[PDB]
Structure formats: C-alpha cells, structure tokens
Amino acid sequence: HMFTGLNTPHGVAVDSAGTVYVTDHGNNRVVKLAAGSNTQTVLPFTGLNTPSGVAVDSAGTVYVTDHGNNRVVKLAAGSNTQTVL
Amino acid sequence: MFTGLNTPHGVAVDSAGTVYVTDHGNNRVVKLAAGSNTQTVLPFTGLNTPSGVAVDSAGTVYVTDHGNNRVVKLAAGSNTQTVL
Amino acid sequence: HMFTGLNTPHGVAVDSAGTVYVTDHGNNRVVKLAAGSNTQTVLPFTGLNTPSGVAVDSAGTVYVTDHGNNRVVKLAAGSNTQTVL
C-alpha cells in the first residue's frame, strides 16, 4: 500500500515503464507510482476540480480530464506547468 | 482546442498523440489530433452517459455507454458500430 | 440543491490481442472479453466497491481503481491474488 491518502479514485493509466497514474478525485490531484516504487509523487497539476480520466503517451506526457472545469489538461514529462486542451 | 465539453469522463491517447475524450455530459466522444485546432466528433450514435474510452493499436474506439449497460465499439475506416 | 451527487466513472481497456477489459459496477467486478470467444471471464479481484477504471499494460497486468475502497489493485496475467498498490 504505497499510494498514500487516496480518496475515491476515478481513473488509472499505465505507461511503457510500468508507472501507474491515478486520479485522486477526492483530493483533486493526480498521483503516480513507479513499478515496485515505494513512495508516490503528486503531479504538478493545478486548479483541478474532480480530475476523472487519465492517459499517458509514449513521451510520458500525462493527460487528465478536469471534470468539474469542463476541460482537459496535460503535463509534459518533468514539466511544472500544465497546458489546457 | 476542445470546445463545449461538459462533465468529461474518460481520456485516451493513441501512438500518434491524438487525444480522445468522452464528453459525457454531451453524450459524445471527441478527438483532437496533435497540432490541430479543430476537434472531431466521432460517429457513435445513441450514446447516453458514456464514460470510459479506449483505443486499440488499429484505431478502433471503445466506449462504455448507458452507465453500466454496454460497451460500444467503432471500427476504424468503416465506422461500423457494434455492441461488445 | 441541498443534494448534489457525482456519477462514478465506468472503465474500458483493450490489450494488444484485442481482448477488452470492462468495469461492471452492478456486480462489483471487472471482466474480460476475448475477441470472438462468446466468453465473459470474471477477473479474480477481491472485495471491490464500484470499480471506476481499468488499464492493462503491455505485459497483460490489469490495474483497477477500487473507488469505494480508496485504493488501486492489480493482477498480473495468470495471477490469483491481487496486489494493492
């Protein structure tokens, strides 16, 4: 149990390295966990309201549907600044 | 950019970077190709409260539909819909 | 508007063989449907409360967001016991 503090998760995605990405719908955040990895990272998305779906591409770009704000946001690998689709 | 989304649920991205979104509140699935500024509504019909979306290596799009009732498959090229 | 609820998502995933993975809220389970099998396989997850999402990685490992239990579970292909992440 290496996900910490998850609440009512909405969605899951897995990339080519086995990294798991989860929408923590109840804490308005998106978390990831490497394969066998001990502690999670919170992704630097901002201003989310009920993130719901998640997907990840072969470049490690993470896409999330920000349900409560009627939009979709993405975060490039290693970026601290999302963009809005 | 996406326009007029309402209460979106699932998202999927294929190996070309094209992003598919279940626009759950509007009973449709939309896609946006990498670099395009025009979203496309896929030719599903009859959807109500769709949620999850997936896309296979071939471009067949799968959507959960009518809450827990069904999964609808849209075949690449033909756009034939069938129920899983 | 004293009452405002959210609808829990439903998930679908597809592997490299075209096998389709589906959440089934009503039976609190995740099933898999191989192309032209006429066979619905119930995956041996345990103790699910309204699975909200499913993903499958290149090795056939199946990941599920267990919405009502604030957790993510996984099953490697052929495995009998889920791992909680």
DSSP-derived secondary structure for A38-71 = SS-EE----S-SSEEEEEE-TT--EEEEEGGGTE
DSSP percent split of chain A into helix, strand, coil, nearest 5 = 5, 40, 55
Query: What does the alpha-carbon distance between residue A62 and residue C6 come to, in Å, rounded to a whole number?
Result: 24
The chains in contact with chain C, meaning 3 or more Cβ pairs closer than 8 Å, are A, B
Q: Is A64 close to B11, i.e. CB distance below 8 A?
A: yes
Phi-psi region of B57 (alpha: psi -120 to 50; beta: other; left: phi over 0): alpha
For residue A9, which phi and psi values (nearest 5 degrees)? Answer: -65, 140
Amino acid at B64: T
Of residues B9, B17, B32, nearest to A65 (C-beta): B9
**Cβ–Cβ < 8 Å for A53, A22:** no
Q: Count the neighbouring beta carbons within 10 Å of the beta carbon of residue A84.
A: 12
| Distant-in-sequence, close-in-space partners of A51: CB < 8 Å, separation ≥ 6 | A10, A11, A23, A24, A25, A28, A29, A30, A45, A64, A65, A66, A67
Residues of A in contact with B10 (CB under 8 A): 11, 52-53, 65
Query: What does the alpha-carbon distance between residue A29 and residue A11 come to, in Å, rounded to a whole number?
Result: 11
Phi-psi region of B26 (alpha: psi -120 to 50; beta: other; left: phi over 0): alpha
Beta strands A29-33 and A41-42, pairing class: antiparallel
Find the largest Cα–Cα distance for chain B.
35
Distance from CA of C11 to the nearest CA of B (A): 4
Query: What does the alpha-carbon distance between residue A72 and residue B9 come to, in Å, rounded to a whole number?
Result: 10
CATH for A1-85? 2.40.10.500
Tokens of C52: 């909200």
Structural domain spans, chain C: 1-85
Q: What is the resolution of this structure in A?
A: 1.6
